[PDB]
Design an enzyme around this catalytic site. Structure first.
Site, short mmCIF file in Angstrom:
data_model
loop_
_atom_site.label_atom_id
_atom_site.label_comp_id
_atom_site.label_asym_id
_atom_site.label_seq_id
_atom_site.Cartn_x
_atom_site.Cartn_y
_atom_site.Cartn_z
N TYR A 144 -6.82 14.08 -2.03
CA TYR A 144 -6.67 13.25 -0.81
C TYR A 144 -6.12 14.12 0.31
O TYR A 144 -5.20 14.94 0.08
CB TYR A 144 -5.70 12.10 -1.11
CG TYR A 144 -5.24 11.29 0.08
CD1 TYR A 144 -5.98 10.24 0.58
CD2 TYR A 144 -4.00 11.51 0.63
CE1 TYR A 144 -5.54 9.47 1.64
CE2 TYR A 144 -3.53 10.74 1.69
CZ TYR A 144 -4.30 9.72 2.20
OH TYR A 144 -3.81 8.99 3.25
N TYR A 183 -11.21 11.60 0.32
CA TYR A 183 -10.82 11.24 -1.07
C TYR A 183 -11.86 11.82 -2.03
O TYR A 183 -13.10 11.65 -1.79
CB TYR A 183 -10.87 9.73 -1.28
CG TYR A 183 -9.89 8.88 -0.52
CD1 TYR A 183 -10.14 8.42 0.76
CD2 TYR A 183 -8.74 8.42 -1.16
CE1 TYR A 183 -9.27 7.56 1.42
CE2 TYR A 183 -7.85 7.58 -0.51
CZ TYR A 183 -8.10 7.16 0.78
OH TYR A 183 -7.20 6.31 1.37
N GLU A 193 -10.03 10.94 6.99
CA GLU A 193 -9.26 10.71 5.75
C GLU A 193 -10.26 10.89 4.62
O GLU A 193 -11.29 10.17 4.64
CB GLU A 193 -8.64 9.30 5.73
CG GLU A 193 -7.69 9.11 4.58
CD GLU A 193 -7.05 7.73 4.53
OE1 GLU A 193 -7.71 6.76 4.97
OE2 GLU A 193 -5.89 7.64 4.09
N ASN A 199 0.89 -1.18 0.00
CA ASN A 199 0.00 0.00 0.00
C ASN A 199 0.92 1.22 0.00
O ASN A 199 1.91 1.24 0.79
CB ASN A 199 -1.03 -0.12 1.13
CG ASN A 199 -2.19 0.85 1.05
OD1 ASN A 199 -2.74 1.17 2.08
ND2 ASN A 199 -2.58 1.31 -0.14
N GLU A 223 -2.44 6.37 -5.46
CA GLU A 223 -2.47 5.29 -4.45
C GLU A 223 -2.46 3.93 -5.16
O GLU A 223 -3.00 3.83 -6.28
CB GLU A 223 -3.68 5.43 -3.51
CG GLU A 223 -3.84 4.26 -2.56
CD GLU A 223 -4.80 4.44 -1.41
OE1 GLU A 223 -4.97 3.45 -0.63
OE2 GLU A 223 -5.36 5.54 -1.27
O1 LIG Z 1 6.61 11.05 6.84
C1 LIG Z 1 7.70 10.78 7.75
C2 LIG Z 1 7.21 9.83 8.84
O2 LIG Z 1 6.33 10.47 9.80
C3 LIG Z 1 6.34 9.68 10.98
O3 LIG Z 1 5.37 8.59 10.98
C4 LIG Z 1 3.99 8.87 10.63
C5 LIG Z 1 3.68 8.85 9.13
O4 LIG Z 1 4.02 7.58 8.59
C6 LIG Z 1 2.19 9.16 8.92
O5 LIG Z 1 1.85 9.01 7.54
C7 LIG Z 1 0.47 8.78 7.21
C8 LIG Z 1 0.12 7.34 7.55
O6 LIG Z 1 -1.14 7.02 7.03
C9 LIG Z 1 -1.26 7.11 5.62
O7 LIG Z 1 -2.60 6.77 5.28
C10 LIG Z 1 -2.82 5.36 5.03
C11 LIG Z 1 -2.62 5.24 3.52
O8 LIG Z 1 -3.46 4.25 2.91
C12 LIG Z 1 -4.81 4.53 3.19
O9 LIG Z 1 -5.57 3.82 2.22
C13 LIG Z 1 -5.06 4.07 4.62
O10 LIG Z 1 -6.44 4.16 5.06
C14 LIG Z 1 -4.22 4.93 5.56
O11 LIG Z 1 -4.13 4.15 6.75
C15 LIG Z 1 -1.03 8.55 5.19
O12 LIG Z 1 -1.01 8.70 3.76
C16 LIG Z 1 0.30 9.05 5.72
O13 LIG Z 1 0.40 10.46 5.43
O14 LIG Z 1 1.97 10.51 9.38
C17 LIG Z 1 2.11 10.63 10.80
C18 LIG Z 1 3.49 10.15 11.30
O15 LIG Z 1 3.47 9.78 12.69
C19 LIG Z 1 3.51 10.89 13.58
O16 LIG Z 1 4.78 11.56 13.57
C20 LIG Z 1 4.75 12.71 14.42
C21 LIG Z 1 4.37 12.35 15.87
O17 LIG Z 1 4.12 13.55 16.61
C22 LIG Z 1 3.11 11.49 15.96
O18 LIG Z 1 2.95 11.00 17.30
C23 LIG Z 1 3.23 10.35 14.98
O19 LIG Z 1 2.04 9.58 14.96
C24 LIG Z 1 7.74 9.06 11.06
O20 LIG Z 1 8.47 9.76 12.03
C25 LIG Z 1 8.33 9.15 9.64
O21 LIG Z 1 8.60 7.86 9.04
CL LIG Z 2 -8.14 2.05 3.66
#
Ligand SMILES: OC[C@@H]1O[C@@H](O[C@@H]2[C@@H](O)[C@H](O[C@@H]3CO[C@@H](O[C@@H]4CO[C@@H](O)[C@H](O)[C@H]4O)[C@H](O)[C@H]3O)OC[C@H]2O[C@@H]2OC[C@@H](O)[C@H](O)[C@H]2O)[C@H](O)[C@H]1O
Ligand SMILES: [Cl-]
Ligand SMILES: [Cl-]
Ligand SMILES: [Cl-]
Ligand SMILES: [Cl-]
Ligand SMILES: [Cl-]
Ligand SMILES: [Cl-]
Ligand SMILES: [Cl-]
Ligand SMILES: [Cl-]
Ligand SMILES: [Cl-]
Ligand SMILES: [Cl-]
Ligand SMILES: [Cl-]
Ligand SMILES: [Cl-]
Ligand SMILES: [Cl-]
Ligand SMILES: [Cl-]
Ligand SMILES: [Cl-]
Ligand SMILES: [Cl-]
Ligand SMILES: [Cl-]
Ligand SMILES: [Cl-]
Ligand code: NA
Length: 194
Positions: free
Chosen positions: A78, A89, A87, A46, A177
């Site tokens: 998105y 779309y 989330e 994914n 995606e």
């Molecule tokens: O980007 C650098 C990374 O950020 C930190 O980890 C977390 C990211 O991976 C996260 O990214 C989100 C994750 O969800 C994705 O959405 C998925 C995609 O497929 C859909 O179909 C599905 O329903 C959905 O589940 C989305 O596209 C991404 O954008 O963003 C948050 C981040 O974590 C947070 O970091 C900061 C901290 O303060 C928070 O506590 C923490 O949760 C990593 O550091 C780095 O790899």
């Molecule tokens: Cl999903």
């Protein structure tokens, strides 16, 4: 140009970008001039990647280019809200799998008719980490790659159908995606606040 193969967000040639993969198969994104990016993927798990804006909002998004999934992929405006975490779309194109869920009615926008659905994910990856959240969907009744997405038309229809968005505290991107698929995309985004 800059080739991205690692989860990250940032800015490139005046546009915000986001790249997320679960790490399956092979997934890259190339960041080119202005609002251009391409993706290439082989047997992915994914991923979601694209260019746009550090915060969402009512925007007349203009995009063009190519989107060629072999199997399950989405072309969507998105992004995410907070309070509540949603989330969302606006899907212009897909492969063998059309997004579905609880049907809420239609909205007419940018020369097409969109089906509105709500789904829910439990303890799933998000911009706030492992979280439970609703997903709001607008799905075009006919596939296309390119045109205007009037985000305000979709947000307002969702609101009439009891799907309330939170604050635009997170990104809004013209996303490619993929799910257990291969393909490419080569897209350009721009768009002004409505
Ligand atoms: O980007 C650098 C990374 O950020 C930190 O980890 C977390 C990211 O991976 C996260 O990214 C989100 C994750 O969800 C994705 O959405 C998925 C995609 O497929 C859909 O179909 C599905 O329903 C959905 O589940 C989305 O596209 C991404 O954008 O963003 C948050 C981040 O974590 C947070 O970091 C900061 C901290 O303060 C928070 O506590 C923490 O949760 C990593 O550091 C780095 O790899
Ligand atoms: Cl999903
Ligand atoms: Cl990288
Ligand atoms: Cl950056
Ligand atoms: Cl740059
Ligand atoms: Cl920049
Ligand atoms: Cl921005
Ligand atoms: Cl195409
Ligand atoms: Cl239904
Ligand atoms: Cl419902
Ligand atoms: Cl309707
Ligand atoms: Cl249509
Ligand atoms: Cl669901
Ligand atoms: Cl609900
Ligand atoms: Cl079609
Ligand atoms: Cl197409
Ligand atoms: Cl259009
Ligand atoms: Cl807001
Ligand atoms: Cl964000
Ligand atoms: Na609701």
């Amino acid at each position: 140009a800059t080739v991205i193969t690692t989860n990250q967000t940032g800015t490139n040639n005046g546009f915000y970008y986001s790249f997320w993969t679960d790490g399956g198969g092979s997934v890259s994104m190339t960041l080119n001039s202005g609002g251009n990016y391409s993706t290439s993927w082989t047997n992915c798990g994914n991923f979601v990647a694209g260019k746009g804006w550090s915060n969402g909002g009512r925007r007349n998004v203009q995009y063009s280019g190519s989107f060629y999934p072999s199997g399950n992929g989405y072309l969507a405006l998105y992004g995410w809200t907070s309070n509540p975490l949603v989330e969302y779309y606006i899907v212009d194109n897909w492969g063998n799998y059309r997004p579905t869920g609880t049907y809420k009615g239609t909205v007419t926008s940018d020369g097409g008719t969109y089906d509105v659905y709500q789904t829910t994910r439990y303890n799933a990856p998000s911009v706030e980490g492992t979280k439970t959240f609703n997903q709001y969907w607008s799905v075009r009744q006919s596939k296309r790659t390119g045109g205007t997405i009037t985000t305000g038309n979709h947000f307002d229809a969702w609101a009439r159908y009891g799907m309330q968005l939170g604050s635009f505290s997170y990104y809004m991107i013209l996303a490619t995606e993929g799910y257990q698929s291969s393909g490419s995309s080569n897209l350009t985004v721009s768009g002004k606040l409505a």
